[model samples]
Target: RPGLPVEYLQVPSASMGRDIKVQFQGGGPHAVYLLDGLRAQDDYNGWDINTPAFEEYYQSGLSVIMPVGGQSSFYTDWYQPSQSNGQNYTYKWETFLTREMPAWLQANKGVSPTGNAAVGLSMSGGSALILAAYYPQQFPYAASLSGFLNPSEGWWPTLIGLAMNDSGGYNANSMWGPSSDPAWKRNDPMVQIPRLVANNTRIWVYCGIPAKFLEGLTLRTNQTFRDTYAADGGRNGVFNFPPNGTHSWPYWNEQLVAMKADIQHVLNG
Candidate 1:
């Protein structure tokens, strides 16, 4: 659609099929999975709304995979099936994305059967890294734009619990059980650095300093620790640690243009 090969594709899933809005061009077996924030809407991913990143990808020839919605799911498989936000959701997103969506993309989305990249912002940042580290063969490149990387740390689960409750009445316990639960550490990107290093997964992390312009948002200390871990891992880590913007759409959109290019480079390289 108008300089973008954008289309609506219904991706088969165990969590009842997801209708993904794909904006891409033929790059043959490689694509970029663009994940949304915690307050992801059902209509369209924010990149489509706020940025021209898709237009850039259309030229790069990498198929852009933007999964439509998961308000507070964090793109992970919940501990069990339950009700959240007045909706009874199975929340099997991890399986759906890494297993189901990849297969569908190979058949219908014109991507290579196993090679792909992922970029996530805010909430889905850790999930994107999980996808790449857990299934190294499928996702070789992963990037986080102001992502909440260290989810298992103190106060994070409580904060995330509040966010989930506010977003959709989601029980954080259902997402990963108590903070002591292994699932929390299991999904923590900081804990998974060794896997990324051994798999040679390319990681790009972009975060901000204190935002003098935007109210309330400060530098992401978690992202700073993440950068330290990525450095320790010894993988090909690319960083945009001190950008000019804060954790908002304007910065995410601009960072999308920057990291989107790097992701293409990793996939095509």
Candidate 2:
């Protein structure tokens, strides 16, 4: 039924006081942490749900780590649970991913403590960039597919709030506080470009246009990021805008295949 040794694991999260689900295919020391989007499901990571990510990378000389759940959480450490429907456990994803999970994978699964990559789509796109920039040693490569790059830009907070609410009735204020809060800037990829460049993190960005309204906005955000990254003389990354595309599974899957070489470039190191 599957191409690799796919296993479901429940690792303890001290920050969240619970067991986090992980779909893993352990092989070599290096691994790629595949993050899901805004409507991230608890049943399985979107990569598996929508594409053959795990199977595609089977026995490719590296592990495949897919983290489950985080609907509308932006895969970030939230300030509080949603005030609307609310969550029982605090979303300390930043700590769980950067600290807790890596240690567990190293100790139990034999994955390396460093030299990994993180790839995210839609909401988790910026999360991948943030994590790689913040924890350079853990993630030397990061890729964002149709991600919201500039969340701190004008009216984006409102747009984010509406999307979050629509996704799972989650509250944006609970994530990073009001629009003016410093956390917004902290999570924005536009702000983190310098750190990413400084760390020499290999970045891979992909976006397309003439698609959905949301994807159009994402393209605009990506173009801004691309121009800024180029202006900053950042050469450790690739910005791919294929002139035609959408914010859907097919396009994302294509980019996933396209990013194989870049991911391998990091893993092969």
Candidate 3:
């Protein structure tokens, strides 16, 4: 059974030509947009299904916005159709999340379009930053858990292409043109640090360095992101790199608890 406060909403998305599924709760002025991983399911958000995030935040006065679907999509706008998967829809997730969905929440639910937070894990970890970096007013706070922060570095682009292919037979070329495309750099959080610094967007970055190889990748990228963020004079950021952890739910669950107070503080500010 769904939680008491949970309301399943079908937000219309003219950009994608479909009604986007969103699991929403609470109705206060403050809200958090929680994003999913690479293997995002169409039925519900991974955060709601995999963690106790929604339950923990229930009746906490902070609204929760959990968007569903966009498998293998970096939650960004794609330049072309995903031809490899035979998917006909344009992947304009960046448009839907940043614009259409917010309007719906504002008009129907009385939720403000700006001053909300955005959080993501894995593929969406850097995506949250990109959204906040570009739309600072919409998302004044962002958090990334076990995210691939700098995808344009070294062979990371190739690895991401392979991961996308495995996730849903998605073609990376369809995402942002070829790997060498400038769009890759534009989407890289490392490159967006200056913008984040300028906006003074509150950021929380966490990664585990343990047995999992994927967590190691995230840890390295997140460390670099942390260093670069400071190097660029960004002061409103915090990081947690535990000595032993993995890129999975147990650790992420702890992080949700860790950031709860911080999220509320920023939302109230």
What are the models' TM-scores? 0.88, 0.94, 0.95
The Cα RMSD in angstroms, rounded to one decimal, for candidate 3 relative to the true structure is 2.5
Ranking by TM-score: 3, 2, 1
TM-score preference between candidates 1 and 3, better one: 3
lDDT of 3 by residue, 169-188 (tens): 99999998887899999999
Q: lDDT per residue, candidate 1, 89-197, as tens digits?
A: 5688888787777777777645775678888888888788888889988888888887767788765778788878988688888889999999999998878888888
Single out the weakest 10-residue window by summed lDDT for candidate 3: 209-218
Cα displacement (angstroms), candidate 1, residue 83, comes to 2.5
Residues 102-192 of candidate 2 have per-residue lDDT tens digits of 9999898678879999999989989999999999999999998888888988757888889899998999999999989999999999988
- What are the Cα lDDT values of the candidates? 0.75, 0.87, 0.88
Clashes of 1: 2
Q: Each candidate: how many clashes?
A: 2, 0, 0
Off by over 4 Å in 1: 1-4, 15-27, 82-84, 209-220, 223-231
